[PDB]
Design a protein around this ligand. Sequence first.
Ligand SMILES: C[C@@H]1CC(=O)Nc2cccc(-c3ccc4c(c3)c(-c3cnn(C)c3)nn4C)c2N1
Ligand code: NA
Ligand SMILES: [Zn+2]
Ligand SMILES: [Zn+2]
Ligand SMILES: [Zn+2]
Length: 226
Amino acid sequence: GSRKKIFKPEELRQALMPTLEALYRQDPESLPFRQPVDPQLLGIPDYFDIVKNPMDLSTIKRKLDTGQYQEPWQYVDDVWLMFNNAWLYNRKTSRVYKFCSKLAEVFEQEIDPVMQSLGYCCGRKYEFSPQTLCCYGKQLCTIPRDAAYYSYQNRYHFCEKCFTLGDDPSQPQTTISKDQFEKKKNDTLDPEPFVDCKECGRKMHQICVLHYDIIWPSGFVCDNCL
Ligand SMILES: C[C@@H]1CC(=O)Nc2cccc(-c3ccc4c(c3)c(-c3cnn(C)c3)nn4C)c2N1
Ligand code: NA
Ligand SMILES: [Zn+2]
Ligand SMILES: [Zn+2]
Ligand SMILES: [Zn+2]
């Protein structure tokens, strides 16, 4: 009897379908996304080499219609899987890529009040900005958002101007082949991390619900469960 919130299918369908309809309403931008990708019909036979888990509006609608989502973040995840597949497969200059970006703008403007009506802090999946990275070359030096840099193992980073590795003064350093590195751009957004309400079990964002002047020695409890 731990007060876990169980979402019934009709609750999720009634709340979330208007956000899906807002995407469907976009003409022309929803047109590439209204049906499952058919690589042979479209003439893109390499599609499933790149996209391992396809997703589209019709599949999301069917999942809502048949109760396949236990909680609304799974719906949010499917919407972003659809977007991320298209941003990966298609070139930035292509119409499908640009249409995807329009759909994502619409979704971000629709999802927060809907998720709030379901008891959540908001519906935003990703952090607002790429995290600032540390540059190994200098001590002061850091890599800001949208900056170019080099990275081995997604661990050790050098800004391009600075570009014998170690992560601690006592750690014996190792020589790594320069240009074993990959050049990257600091433009990736990570998912906003969660904390679960210990009563209802809802996943809430740490940044949304945990404040600099509040402690939770016995565990986080959301506003509606207090
Ligand atoms: C998401 C899916 C697969 C994908 O990642 N890239 C892709 C490449 C070529 C065509 C389409 C595609 C498929 C179906 C489509 C369309 C495009 C369009 C369409 C309408 N206007 N424009 C520019 C494309 N309508 N339909 C039903 C497409 N989209
Ligand atoms: Na265009
Ligand atoms: Zn939030
Ligand atoms: Zn540097
Ligand atoms: Zn709660």
